[PDB]
Amino acid sequence: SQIRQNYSTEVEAAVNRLVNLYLRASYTYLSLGFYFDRDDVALEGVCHFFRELAEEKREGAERLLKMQNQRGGRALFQDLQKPSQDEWGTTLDAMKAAIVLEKSLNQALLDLHALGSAQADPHLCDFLESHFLDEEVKLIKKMGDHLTNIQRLVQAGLGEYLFERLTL
């Protein structure tokens, strides 16, 4: 690329993999959202929480793709694997699975940052710090707070209703 400067092939590849991970996370949250919209589950606040996350994760992938082009890297897409479950159980099960998912994304961001540092690519490092690392820490804190409240509430049915009504 005429513009490409200080952008390693290793980082270019890792950014494409991270795009895949973000899109897959978006897909998982799409599945979570619509599961809570089932007439036999029917927790609308929970559905909204996960649909909003689907949107955030898609947006993250697009920001990565924009950056890939800004640096003169080449976007390469792979299949998006279907989410790991078809039914997501209780709000508690779902929030546990969400925190597992976010910790995996966070670890991928930290791995990519370490790669960037090793490659002396400060634009990449700052990009991740400025748009992704703090967002992940904030989101994981919120999920952890939600998990704690869900657990203190679970008369499990009543607790699930009240969390959806009064927190979400």
Interacting residues toward ligand 2MY by CB under 6 A: 23, 26-27, 30, 54, 58, 80
Tallying the residues shown for the chain, one arrives at 168
Nearest distance from C-beta of residue 28 to ligand 2MY, angstroms: 9
Nearest to 57 by CA among 26, 20, 79, 19: 26
Helix axes 134-153, 91-118, angle to 10 degrees: 160
Widest distance between CA atoms in the chain: 64
Q: Which is nearer to ligand 2MY, 69 or 148 (CB)?
A: 69
Nearest distance from C-beta of residue 149 to its own copies, angstroms: 6
Nearest distance from C-beta of residue 150 to its own copies, angstroms: 10
Nearest to 32 by CA among 103, 97, 100, 108: 97
Q: Which is nearer to its own copies, 10 or 119 (CB)?
A: 119
59 marked as part of a ligand binding site: yes
Q: Which is nearer to ligand 2MY, 80 or 166 (CB)?
A: 80
34-41 long-range Cβ contacts below 8 angstroms, 24+ apart: 35/87, 35/88, 35/94, 36/88, 36/91, 36/94
Q: Which is nearer to its own copies, 10 or 85 (CB)?
A: 85
72 binds, among ligand 2MY, its own copies, none (CB under 5 to 8 A by kind): its own copies
Annotated binding site for Fe cation: 52, 55-56, 59, 62
Annotated binding site: 52, 55-56, 59, 62
